[PDB]
Design a protein around this ligand. Structure first.
Ligand code: 12I
Ligand code: 12I
Ligand code: 12I
Ligand code: CU
Ligand code: CU
Ligand code: ZN
Ligand code: ZN
Lengths: 153, 153
């Protein structure tokens, strides 16, 4: 199996640890972990193109989109490769993450390793918001925490 | 060309931005940038195996060594792929990094993207120290700052 990991940090209180595992190169990636310090509700959760944190999370660029598609949710055919939807936090400030995704990979051209995982301010509308921004960013707003996805033991 | 970047962070602050560029996949990688907050003298500078900073720089594991060789300096045939020698800081605490290396890569089996760059406490003896640890770590000591190497624009 192939494994990867991301430590999410930012300028505020949001922080987390996300793990990735892919049993087979043509198989799904399991994604799990925790993010704390969040406001209650949905927070957009994406892989962005660049593993560049030079100036903070802004440096990561747009959603990872090697197929030049519109933004969507993880269960949509029309999505960016990096579109992992939302994480949802309770009034404890914690989002428990446990998902499986069939479009991201830890090898090949859809590889997310070396790119940035970002948790956002606001909900991602999964491209169903009915405006132009919805099909580019999902209207998820600013970047609260991020990290470069790295190769794990 | 292919480009990568690493934001190094540690207590001091020891911090720096290191850029990587490789004109072709069969060619050398140019490495440049600046690290501040260092004590005067040599500091070991290596790519470590894992891009895991879960518990800090310790989580990055040993030097990146896909070929199962002993530790050396960057000019040695017998070296780890991750062996980039030392950076040298002056009294101002700044090391200017300018390296070209023919063994690291930003693609293929020796790709360093997704792995951790680390700057160390002490000098790397380049495997010439005459003891057991010299040919494993270069006796460079603890890890002052690190970051995951990411894909750049
Ligand atoms: C279920 N999965 C679909 C995505 N998948 C891929 N991984 C890496 N690169 C790819 C390039 C083109 C198409 C699919 C790719 C891995 C397994
Ligand atoms: C192959 N594997 C990858 C997934 N995996 C996990 N390990 C630990 N905690 C988890 C929490 C939620 C979901 C999966 C988890 C271990 C088995
Ligand atoms: C062809 N290239 C243009 C970009 N490039 C550099 N750019 C900016 N500063 C540098 C400082 C020291 C060494 C190389 C540097 C090197 C690769
Ligand atoms: Cu995002
Ligand atoms: Cu090292
Ligand atoms: Zn998207
Ligand atoms: Zn070494």
């Amino acid at each position: 199996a192939t494994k990867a990991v991301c430590v999410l940090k930012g300028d505020g209180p949001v922080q987390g640890i996300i793990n990735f595992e892919q049993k087979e190169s043509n198989g799904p990636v399991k994604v799990w972990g925790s993010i704390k310090g969040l406001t209650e509700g949905l927070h957009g959760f994406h892989v962005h193109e660049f593993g560049d944190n030079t100036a903070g999370c802004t440096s990561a660029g747009p959603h990872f989109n090697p197929l030049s598609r519109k933004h969507g949710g993880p269960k949509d055919e029309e999505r960016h490769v990096g579109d992992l939807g939302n994480v949802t936090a309770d009034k404890d400030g914690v989002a428990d993450v446990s998902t499986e995704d069939s479009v991201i990979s830890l090898s090949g051209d859809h590889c997310i390793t070396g790119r940035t995982l970002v948790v956002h301010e606001k909900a991602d509308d999964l491209g169903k918001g009915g405006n132009e921004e919805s099909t580019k960013t999902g209207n998820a707003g600013s970047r609260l925490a991020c990290g470069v996805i790295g190769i794990a033991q």
